[PDB]
Design an enzyme around this catalytic site. Structure first.
Site, PDB file in Angstrom:
ATOM      1  N   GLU A   5      -5.521  -3.138  -6.559  1.00 16.33           N
ATOM      2  CA  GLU A   5      -5.820  -4.045  -5.451  1.00 16.33           C
ATOM      3  C   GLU A   5      -6.844  -5.090  -5.876  1.00 16.33           C
ATOM      4  O   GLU A   5      -7.772  -4.773  -6.625  1.00 16.33           O
ATOM      5  CB  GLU A   5      -6.377  -3.280  -4.261  1.00 16.33           C
ATOM      6  CG  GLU A   5      -5.548  -2.074  -3.827  1.00 16.33           C
ATOM      7  CD  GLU A   5      -4.428  -2.421  -2.882  1.00 16.33           C
ATOM      8  OE1 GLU A   5      -4.115  -3.625  -2.702  1.00 16.33           O
ATOM      9  OE2 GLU A   5      -3.843  -1.467  -2.310  1.00 16.33           O
TER      10      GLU A   5
ATOM     11  N   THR B 183       2.200   2.908   5.453  1.00 17.84           N
ATOM     12  CA  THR B 183       2.644   1.514   5.600  1.00 17.84           C
ATOM     13  C   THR B 183       2.287   0.706   4.344  1.00 17.84           C
ATOM     14  O   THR B 183       1.536   1.165   3.480  1.00 17.84           O
ATOM     15  CB  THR B 183       1.947   0.857   6.818  1.00 17.84           C
ATOM     16  OG1 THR B 183       0.537   1.028   6.660  1.00 17.84           O
ATOM     17  CG2 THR B 183       2.397   1.524   8.167  1.00 17.84           C
ATOM     18  N   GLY B 184       2.863  -0.484   4.242  1.00 19.59           N
ATOM     19  CA  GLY B 184       2.440  -1.461   3.248  1.00 19.59           C
ATOM     20  C   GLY B 184       2.590  -2.831   3.872  1.00 19.59           C
ATOM     21  O   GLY B 184       3.540  -3.075   4.610  1.00 19.59           O
ATOM     22  N   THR B 185       1.657  -3.731   3.566  1.00 19.51           N
ATOM     23  CA  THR B 185       1.692  -5.093   4.089  1.00 19.51           C
ATOM     24  C   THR B 185       1.161  -5.983   2.958  1.00 19.51           C
ATOM     25  O   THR B 185       0.258  -5.577   2.239  1.00 19.51           O
ATOM     26  CB  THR B 185       0.778  -5.253   5.346  1.00 19.51           C
ATOM     27  OG1 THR B 185       1.137  -4.271   6.333  1.00 19.51           O
ATOM     28  CG2 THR B 185       0.949  -6.610   5.932  1.00 19.51           C
TER      29      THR B 185
ATOM     30  N   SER C 243       0.914  -1.152   0.000  1.00 15.37           N
ATOM     31  CA  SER C 243       0.000   0.000   0.000  1.00 15.37           C
ATOM     32  C   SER C 243       0.938   1.182   0.000  1.00 15.37           C
ATOM     33  O   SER C 243       0.300   2.396   0.076  1.00 15.37           O
ATOM     34  CB  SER C 243      -0.774  -0.049   1.302  1.00 15.37           C
ATOM     35  OG  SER C 243      -1.743  -1.070   1.002  1.00 15.37           O
TER      36      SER C 243
ATOM     37  N   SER D 162      -5.190   2.850   5.027  1.00 14.30           N
ATOM     38  CA  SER D 162      -4.651   2.061   3.922  1.00 14.30           C
ATOM     39  C   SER D 162      -5.792   1.322   3.217  1.00 14.30           C
ATOM     40  O   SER D 162      -5.723   0.124   2.978  1.00 14.30           O
ATOM     41  CB  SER D 162      -3.533   1.109   4.380  1.00 14.30           C
ATOM     42  OG  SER D 162      -2.780   0.679   3.248  1.00 14.30           O
TER      43      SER D 162
END
Ligand SMILES: *C(=O)[C@@H]([C@@H]1N=C(C(=O)O)[C@@H](S[C@@H]2CN[C@H](C(=O)N(C)C)C2)[C@@H]1C)[C@@H](C)O
EC number: 3.5.2.6
Length: 265
Positions: free
Chosen positions: A140, A209-211, A42, A100
Protein backbone atom coordinates in the site's frame (compact mmCIF):
# COMPACT_ATOMS: atom_id res chain seq x y z
CA UNK A 1 -30.54 -15.07 -17.91
CA UNK A 2 -27.63 -14.13 -15.63
CA UNK A 3 -25.19 -13.17 -18.37
CA UNK A 4 -27.72 -10.72 -19.84
CA UNK A 5 -28.35 -9.26 -16.37
CA UNK A 6 -24.61 -8.84 -15.70
CA UNK A 7 -24.11 -7.18 -19.13
CA UNK A 8 -27.00 -4.78 -18.27
CA UNK A 9 -25.19 -3.83 -15.04
CA UNK A 10 -21.98 -3.16 -16.96
CA UNK A 11 -23.83 -0.72 -19.22
CA UNK A 12 -25.61 0.90 -16.21
CA UNK A 13 -22.39 1.58 -14.31
CA UNK A 14 -20.04 2.02 -17.33
CA UNK A 15 -18.12 -0.80 -15.71
CA UNK A 16 -16.36 -4.10 -16.27
CA UNK A 17 -17.79 -6.76 -13.91
CA UNK A 18 -16.39 -10.16 -12.96
CA UNK A 19 -18.32 -12.77 -10.98
CA UNK A 20 -17.45 -16.28 -9.82
CA UNK A 21 -19.28 -18.77 -7.62
CA UNK A 22 -17.65 -22.26 -7.50
CA UNK A 23 -19.78 -25.28 -8.37
CA UNK A 24 -21.28 -27.23 -5.47
CA UNK A 25 -23.24 -30.28 -5.03
CA UNK A 26 -26.08 -29.31 -7.04
CA UNK A 27 -25.23 -25.88 -8.43
CA UNK A 28 -23.22 -25.21 -11.54
CA UNK A 29 -20.41 -22.66 -11.29
CA UNK A 30 -21.61 -19.10 -11.92
CA UNK A 31 -19.09 -17.25 -14.05
CA UNK A 32 -18.96 -13.89 -15.80
CA UNK A 33 -15.58 -12.56 -16.99
CA UNK A 34 -14.39 -14.94 -14.28
CA UNK A 35 -10.95 -15.52 -15.79
CA UNK A 36 -10.27 -11.87 -16.57
CA UNK A 37 -7.72 -10.14 -14.36
CA UNK A 38 -8.93 -7.49 -11.87
CA UNK A 39 -6.86 -5.56 -9.30
CA UNK A 40 -6.86 -7.28 -5.88
CA UNK A 41 -7.07 -3.95 -4.19
CA UNK A 42 -7.58 -4.73 -0.25
CA UNK A 43 -9.15 -8.32 -1.07
CA UNK A 44 -5.54 -9.65 -0.75
CA UNK A 45 -5.72 -8.98 3.01
CA UNK A 46 -7.86 -12.10 3.56
CA UNK A 47 -5.24 -14.51 2.19
CA UNK A 48 -2.51 -12.32 3.78
CA UNK A 49 -3.92 -12.95 7.25
CA UNK A 50 -4.21 -16.67 6.39
CA UNK A 51 -0.50 -16.63 5.32
CA UNK A 52 0.58 -14.98 8.57
CA UNK A 53 -1.59 -17.35 10.67
CA UNK A 54 -0.27 -20.40 8.82
CA UNK A 55 3.37 -19.31 9.10
CA UNK A 56 3.44 -18.89 12.89
CA UNK A 57 2.36 -20.39 16.19
CA UNK A 58 -1.03 -19.11 17.18
CA UNK A 59 0.51 -17.06 20.01
CA UNK A 60 2.45 -14.94 17.47
CA UNK A 61 -0.85 -12.99 17.56
CA UNK A 62 0.33 -11.58 20.87
CA UNK A 63 3.58 -10.09 19.53
CA UNK A 64 3.60 -6.28 19.73
CA UNK A 65 4.54 -4.47 16.50
CA UNK A 66 5.68 -0.86 16.72
CA UNK A 67 5.58 1.64 13.84
CA UNK A 68 5.87 5.36 13.23
CA UNK A 69 4.72 8.38 11.22
CA UNK A 70 6.46 7.34 8.02
CA UNK A 71 4.65 3.95 8.07
CA UNK A 72 1.25 5.59 7.60
CA UNK A 73 0.96 5.89 3.82
CA UNK A 74 -2.62 4.79 3.02
CA UNK A 75 -6.12 4.67 4.57
CA UNK A 76 -5.50 3.22 8.06
CA UNK A 77 -8.50 3.85 10.34
CA UNK A 78 -7.14 1.73 13.20
CA UNK A 79 -3.37 2.00 12.82
CA UNK A 80 -3.59 5.80 12.84
CA UNK A 81 -5.22 5.61 16.36
CA UNK A 82 -2.66 3.27 17.65
CA UNK A 83 0.65 4.58 16.35
CA UNK A 84 1.75 5.87 19.75
CA UNK A 85 1.34 2.49 21.48
CA UNK A 86 1.95 -0.16 18.76
CA UNK A 87 -0.39 -2.99 17.74
CA UNK A 88 -0.13 -6.74 18.24
CA UNK A 89 -0.16 -9.07 15.20
CA UNK A 90 -3.72 -10.07 16.27
CA UNK A 91 -4.76 -6.40 16.30
CA UNK A 92 -3.16 -5.92 12.87
CA UNK A 93 -5.02 -8.92 11.40
CA UNK A 94 -8.27 -7.59 12.92
CA UNK A 95 -7.76 -4.09 11.47
CA UNK A 96 -6.58 -5.35 8.04
CA UNK A 97 -9.73 -7.47 7.60
CA UNK A 98 -12.42 -5.54 9.52
CA UNK A 99 -11.46 -1.91 8.66
CA UNK A 100 -9.36 -2.75 5.59
CA UNK A 101 -6.46 -0.95 7.29
CA UNK A 102 -3.59 -0.30 4.83
CA UNK A 103 -0.81 0.22 7.37
CA UNK A 104 -1.87 -3.05 9.07
CA UNK A 105 -1.53 -4.85 5.74
CA UNK A 106 1.90 -3.34 5.09
CA UNK A 107 3.07 -4.40 8.55
CA UNK A 108 1.66 -7.91 8.02
CA UNK A 109 3.49 -8.15 4.68
CA UNK A 110 6.72 -7.16 6.51
CA UNK A 111 6.00 -9.83 9.15
CA UNK A 112 5.65 -12.47 6.46
CA UNK A 113 8.98 -11.12 5.20
CA UNK A 114 11.27 -11.97 2.30
CA UNK A 115 11.76 -10.13 -1.05
CA UNK A 116 9.49 -7.28 -2.18
CA UNK A 117 8.61 -6.47 1.46
CA UNK A 118 6.64 -9.71 1.77
CA UNK A 119 4.85 -9.58 -1.61
CA UNK A 120 6.88 -12.50 -2.98
CA UNK A 121 6.06 -14.73 0.06
CA UNK A 122 2.42 -13.64 -0.20
CA UNK A 123 2.37 -14.74 -3.86
CA UNK A 124 4.17 -17.96 -2.80
CA UNK A 125 1.38 -18.64 -0.30
CA UNK A 126 -1.22 -18.41 -3.12
CA UNK A 127 0.88 -20.73 -5.28
CA UNK A 128 0.82 -23.32 -2.42
CA UNK A 129 -2.97 -23.24 -2.69
CA UNK A 130 -2.77 -24.03 -6.41
CA UNK A 131 -3.39 -20.46 -7.59
CA UNK A 132 -1.00 -20.02 -10.55
CA UNK A 133 -2.79 -16.80 -11.68
CA UNK A 134 -2.74 -14.14 -8.94
CA UNK A 135 0.25 -11.94 -8.14
CA UNK A 136 1.08 -9.24 -5.63
CA UNK A 137 3.91 -6.90 -6.59
CA UNK A 138 3.63 -3.80 -4.39
CA UNK A 139 2.41 -2.81 -0.96
CA UNK A 140 0.00 0.00 0.00
CA UNK A 141 -0.76 2.43 -1.56
CA UNK A 142 0.93 1.42 -4.85
CA UNK A 143 -0.87 -1.92 -5.27
CA UNK A 144 -4.20 -0.08 -6.00
CA UNK A 145 -2.77 2.13 -8.73
CA UNK A 146 -1.75 -0.12 -11.61
CA UNK A 147 -3.34 1.01 -14.89
CA UNK A 148 -6.34 -0.93 -16.31
CA UNK A 149 -5.05 -4.12 -18.01
CA UNK A 150 -1.71 -4.16 -16.17
CA UNK A 151 -1.20 -7.59 -14.59
CA UNK A 152 0.65 -6.35 -11.53
CA UNK A 153 -1.33 -6.82 -8.28
CA UNK A 154 -4.15 -8.76 -9.95
CA UNK A 155 -6.23 -11.84 -9.37
CA UNK A 156 -9.35 -13.15 -11.14
CA UNK A 157 -12.79 -13.79 -9.66
CA UNK A 158 -12.16 -17.50 -10.39
CA UNK A 159 -8.68 -17.65 -8.76
CA UNK A 160 -9.64 -15.74 -5.62
CA UNK A 161 -12.90 -17.71 -5.12
CA UNK A 162 -10.93 -20.98 -5.17
CA UNK A 163 -8.39 -19.53 -2.71
CA UNK A 164 -11.11 -18.30 -0.34
CA UNK A 165 -12.95 -21.61 -0.59
CA UNK A 166 -9.82 -23.45 0.62
CA UNK A 167 -9.19 -20.98 3.44
CA UNK A 168 -12.71 -20.87 4.93
CA UNK A 169 -14.42 -24.09 3.82
CA UNK A 170 -11.43 -26.31 3.04
CA UNK A 171 -8.41 -27.47 4.98
CA UNK A 172 -5.78 -24.85 4.00
CA UNK A 173 -5.67 -23.84 7.68
CA UNK A 174 -6.00 -25.90 10.89
CA UNK A 175 -9.44 -25.42 12.51
CA UNK A 176 -8.22 -22.96 15.13
CA UNK A 177 -6.56 -20.64 12.60
CA UNK A 178 -9.48 -21.15 10.17
CA UNK A 179 -11.91 -19.96 12.87
CA UNK A 180 -9.83 -16.80 13.51
CA UNK A 181 -9.94 -15.87 9.81
CA UNK A 182 -13.66 -16.71 9.45
CA UNK A 183 -14.59 -14.68 12.57
CA UNK A 184 -12.67 -11.59 11.41
CA UNK A 185 -14.41 -11.76 8.02
CA UNK A 186 -17.73 -12.40 9.82
CA UNK A 187 -17.20 -9.17 11.79
CA UNK A 188 -16.16 -7.06 8.79
CA UNK A 189 -17.41 -3.45 8.98
CA UNK A 190 -16.78 -2.38 5.38
CA UNK A 191 -19.10 -4.72 3.42
CA UNK A 192 -22.71 -3.77 4.27
CA UNK A 193 -23.41 -2.28 0.80
CA UNK A 194 -21.84 -5.04 -1.26
CA UNK A 195 -22.39 -8.79 -1.32
CA UNK A 196 -24.21 -8.48 2.06
CA UNK A 197 -26.79 -6.15 0.46
CA UNK A 198 -27.68 -8.79 -2.18
CA UNK A 199 -28.46 -11.70 0.15
CA UNK A 200 -31.49 -11.98 2.46
CA UNK A 201 -30.93 -11.38 6.18
CA UNK A 202 -31.33 -15.07 7.09
CA UNK A 203 -28.22 -15.90 5.02
CA UNK A 204 -24.90 -15.58 6.92
CA UNK A 205 -22.33 -13.46 5.09
CA UNK A 206 -18.61 -13.00 5.83
CA UNK A 207 -16.47 -10.94 3.45
CA UNK A 208 -13.43 -8.79 2.59
CA UNK A 209 -13.85 -5.71 0.36
CA UNK A 210 -11.46 -3.92 -1.98
CA UNK A 211 -11.70 -0.40 -3.37
CA UNK A 212 -9.23 1.42 -5.63
CA UNK A 213 -8.48 3.80 -8.44
CA UNK A 214 -10.17 3.61 -11.85
CA UNK A 215 -13.48 2.98 -10.09
CA UNK A 216 -12.38 -0.35 -8.58
CA UNK A 217 -14.81 -2.03 -6.19
CA UNK A 218 -14.49 -5.66 -5.15
CA UNK A 219 -15.95 -8.01 -2.57
CA UNK A 220 -15.12 -11.63 -1.78
CA UNK A 221 -17.48 -13.53 0.52
CA UNK A 222 -18.52 -16.88 1.90
CA UNK A 223 -22.27 -17.08 2.39
CA UNK A 224 -24.37 -19.73 4.10
CA UNK A 225 -27.99 -20.44 3.29
CA UNK A 226 -30.51 -20.52 6.18
CA UNK A 227 -29.93 -24.33 6.17
CA UNK A 228 -26.13 -24.04 6.39
CA UNK A 229 -25.22 -24.68 2.73
CA UNK A 230 -22.11 -22.59 1.92
CA UNK A 231 -21.20 -20.83 -1.35
CA UNK A 232 -18.17 -18.68 -2.22
CA UNK A 233 -18.97 -15.44 -4.04
CA UNK A 234 -16.31 -13.27 -5.71
CA UNK A 235 -17.42 -10.05 -7.38
CA UNK A 236 -14.89 -7.61 -8.89
CA UNK A 237 -15.36 -4.41 -10.90
CA UNK A 238 -13.71 -1.34 -12.37
CA UNK A 239 -14.87 1.68 -14.31
CA UNK A 240 -11.69 2.33 -16.30
CA UNK A 241 -13.73 4.42 -18.75
CA UNK A 242 -13.78 7.24 -16.14
CA UNK A 243 -9.99 7.26 -15.75
CA UNK A 244 -7.98 7.24 -12.50
CA UNK A 245 -10.54 9.27 -10.54
CA UNK A 246 -13.59 7.24 -11.62
CA UNK A 247 -15.82 6.70 -8.56
CA UNK A 248 -16.05 3.14 -7.26
CA UNK A 249 -19.72 2.12 -7.25
CA UNK A 250 -20.72 -0.37 -4.52
CA UNK A 251 -24.26 -0.47 -5.87
CA UNK A 252 -22.98 -2.50 -8.84
CA UNK A 253 -21.74 -5.18 -6.43
CA UNK A 254 -25.03 -5.16 -4.47
CA UNK A 255 -26.98 -5.66 -7.72
CA UNK A 256 -24.67 -8.40 -9.04
CA UNK A 257 -24.91 -10.12 -5.61
CA UNK A 258 -28.75 -9.81 -5.71
CA UNK A 259 -28.69 -11.61 -9.08
CA UNK A 260 -26.44 -14.35 -7.69
CA UNK A 261 -28.61 -14.70 -4.55
CA UNK A 262 -31.65 -15.25 -6.80
CA UNK A 263 -30.00 -18.22 -8.51
CA UNK A 264 -28.76 -19.71 -5.22
CA UNK A 265 -32.07 -19.38 -3.29
C1 LIG B 1 -8.24 -1.66 -0.07
O1 LIG B 1 -8.98 -1.93 -1.03
C2 LIG B 1 -7.94 -0.19 0.33
C3 LIG B 1 -8.87 0.20 1.50
N1 LIG B 1 -9.94 -0.79 1.45
C4 LIG B 1 -11.13 -0.22 1.46
C5 LIG B 1 -12.37 -1.08 1.35
O2 LIG B 1 -12.20 -2.29 1.25
O3 LIG B 1 -13.48 -0.52 1.38
C6 LIG B 1 -11.05 1.28 1.66
S1 LIG B 1 -11.15 1.63 3.47
C7 LIG B 1 -12.89 1.35 4.01
C8 LIG B 1 -13.92 2.10 3.17
N2 LIG B 1 -13.74 3.48 3.62
C9 LIG B 1 -13.67 3.38 5.10
C10 LIG B 1 -12.77 4.47 5.79
O4 LIG B 1 -12.70 4.44 7.02
N3 LIG B 1 -12.13 5.41 5.05
C11 LIG B 1 -12.23 5.45 3.57
C12 LIG B 1 -11.36 6.34 5.62
C13 LIG B 1 -13.13 1.95 5.39
C14 LIG B 1 -9.61 1.56 1.25
C15 LIG B 1 -9.55 2.07 -0.20
C16 LIG B 1 -6.44 0.01 0.64
C17 LIG B 1 -6.11 1.50 0.79
O5 LIG B 1 -5.99 -0.75 1.80
Amino acid sequence: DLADRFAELERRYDARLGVYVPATGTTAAIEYRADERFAFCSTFKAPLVAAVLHQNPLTHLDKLITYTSDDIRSISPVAQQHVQTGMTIGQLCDAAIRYSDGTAANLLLADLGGPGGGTAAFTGYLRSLGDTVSRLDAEEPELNRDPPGDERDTTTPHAIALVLQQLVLGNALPPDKRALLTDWMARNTTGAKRIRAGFPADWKVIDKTGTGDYGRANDIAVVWSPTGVPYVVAVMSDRAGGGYDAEPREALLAEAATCVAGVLA
